[PDB]
Design an enzyme around this catalytic site. Structure first.
Site, short mmCIF file in Angstrom:
data_model
loop_
_atom_site.label_atom_id
_atom_site.label_comp_id
_atom_site.label_asym_id
_atom_site.label_seq_id
_atom_site.Cartn_x
_atom_site.Cartn_y
_atom_site.Cartn_z
N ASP A 59 26.33 39.48 37.51
CA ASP A 59 27.57 39.38 38.26
C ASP A 59 27.70 38.06 38.99
OD1 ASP A 59 27.21 42.12 37.56
OD2 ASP A 59 28.05 42.80 39.45
N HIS A 61 31.18 37.39 40.68
CA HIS A 61 32.09 37.78 41.76
C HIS A 61 32.63 36.61 42.57
CE1 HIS A 61 32.17 42.01 41.20
NE2 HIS A 61 30.87 42.16 41.34
N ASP A 87 32.01 40.97 35.56
CA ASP A 87 32.21 40.85 37.00
C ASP A 87 32.30 39.41 37.47
OD1 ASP A 87 32.53 43.62 37.10
OD2 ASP A 87 30.88 43.92 38.51
N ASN A 119 33.29 45.99 35.06
CA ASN A 119 34.23 46.96 35.64
C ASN A 119 35.32 46.29 36.51
OD1 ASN A 119 31.99 46.73 37.50
ND2 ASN A 119 32.93 48.39 38.71
N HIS A 168 27.51 45.66 30.64
CA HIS A 168 27.64 45.43 32.04
C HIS A 168 27.00 46.54 32.90
CE1 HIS A 168 29.13 44.00 35.74
NE2 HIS A 168 29.59 45.20 36.01
N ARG A 216 29.46 56.13 42.72
CA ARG A 216 30.65 55.28 42.63
C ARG A 216 31.96 56.07 42.46
NH1 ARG A 216 29.09 49.77 41.37
NH2 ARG A 216 26.97 49.62 40.55
N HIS A 243 25.73 44.69 37.28
CA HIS A 243 26.51 45.77 37.95
C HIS A 243 25.99 46.21 39.33
CE1 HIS A 243 29.50 49.01 37.92
NE2 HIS A 243 28.63 49.97 37.65
#
Ligand SMILES: CO[C@@H]([C@H](O)CC(=O)[C@@H](C)[C@@H](O)CC[C@@H](C)[C@@H]1O[C@]2(CC[C@@H](C)[C@H](CC[C@H](C)C(C)=O)O2)CC[C@@H]1C)[C@H](OC(=O)C[C@@H](O)/C(C(=O)O)=C(\C)C(=O)O)C(C)C
Ligand SMILES: [Cl-]
Ligand SMILES: [Mn+2]
Ligand SMILES: [Mn+2]
Ligand code: NA
Length: 294
Positions: A59, A61, A87, A119, A168, A216, A243
């Site tokens: 990730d 981000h 991500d 996601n 992922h 989650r 993730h």
């Protein structure tokens, strides 16, 4: 029509600037990057068949300056082949720079540079966790939808040299055959449940036996014997996924049959984690390049 080298040059120019300096491409340029990359994603399989050696990142981000560090350490494309596990956007301050550089490199080096769907590459999610807001502020919501249309075409898994299964999130209780992944049609949104959902959302868990509820609110958790059984069945050596923020930037699971990679150090400004990138050599031996926490 697209001058990729100009775009890449502007994106890279801020190396060594005060971390946080923006790169503001034109709306037309970003549209172009989305449209051309979308075509390339659709032209390549949804389940990628890749060769080592390569670098694998988890990730990002929107931590653009950390992305630049990963390239500095790993070699700017095409000096190394890259696979990113998703991500790209949300949480961080510079999702736009992040995704534009990644898309530009996909267009420049489409057989040597690969992006999977996370996601957060999903309108429902990135509406909530920052990317919509970043788009509305710096561009407009029409450009946000252009991004969405591109994200809806990303591939969802990769297998490296028939031995490392990459995605992922994780495994699915619906995943019996690799053909099931290959059958998934694009463009698609991420559904609320099922195979595609689970590949983007599931997590391994040391305390679950079999399949468990995911905190989650989406998908499942899975245990070490699920991993063991999956590898045996499909003649694989390793699951590589992302993730979940992990303190060392990477974390092994199930007697090293699975690894989690997370490439954004000091995640959100809230964690004190390292970010890691995994180097896979010609014989599939794994090592790490690490952005230590501040
Ligand atoms: C607190 O909850 C966890 C995360 O912090 C937050 C998340 O995982 C969220 C992205 C997730 O919970 C949001 C799901 C939520 C939008 C969904 O919303 C619904 C309703 C709205 C609807 C549009 C949506 C569609 C879901 C469907 C799968 C689609 C299209 O995406 O479904 C119902 C089901 C579900 C509740 C937490 O996970 C972590 O801490 C892992 C860390 O890596 C992380 C992360 O998100 O990965 C952090 C710290 C973070 O950034 O929050 C964990 C302890 C369970
Ligand atoms: Cl298990
Ligand atoms: Mn994720
Ligand atoms: Mn994430
Ligand atoms: Na590359």
């Amino acid at each position: 029509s697209l001058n990729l080298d100009s775009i890449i040059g502007r994106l890279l120019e801020v190396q060594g600037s005060r971390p946080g300096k923006n790169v503001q491409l034109t709306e037309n340029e970003i549209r172009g990057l989305c449209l051309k990359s979308r075509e390339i994603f659709l032209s390549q399989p949804i389940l990628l068949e890749l060769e080592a050696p390569l670098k694998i990142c988890g990730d990002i981000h929107g931590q653009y300056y950390d992305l630049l560090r990963l390239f500095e350490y790993g070699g700017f494309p095409p000096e190394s082949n890259y696979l990113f596990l998703g991500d790209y956007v949300d949480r961080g301050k510079q999702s736009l720079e992040t995704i534009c550089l990644l898309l530009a490199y996909k267009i420049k080096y489409p057989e040597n540079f690969f992006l999977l769907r996370g996601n957060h590459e999903c309108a429902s999610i990135n509406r909530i966790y920052g990317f919509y807001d970043e788009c509305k502020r710096r561009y407009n919501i029409k450009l946000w939808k252009t991004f969405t249309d591109c994200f809806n075409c990303l591939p969802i898994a990769a297998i490296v040299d028939e031995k490392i299964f990459c995605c992922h999130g994780g495994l699915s209780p619906d995943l019996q055959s690799m053909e099931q992944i290959r059958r998934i049609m694009r463009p698609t949104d991420v559904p609320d449940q099922g195979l595609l959902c689970d590949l983007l959302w599931s997590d391994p868990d040391k305390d679950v036996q079999g399949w468990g509820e995911n905190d989650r609110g989406v998908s499942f958790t899975f245990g070490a014997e699920v991993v063991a059984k999956f590898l045996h069945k499909h003649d694989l050596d390793l699951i590589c996924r992302a993730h979940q923020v992990v303190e060392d930037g990477y974390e092994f699971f199930a007697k090293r049959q699975l690894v989690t990679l997370f490439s954004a150090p000091n995640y959100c400004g809230e964690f004190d984690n390292a970010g890691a990138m995994m180097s896979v050599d010609e014989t599939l031996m794994c090592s790490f390049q690490i952005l230590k926490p501040a």
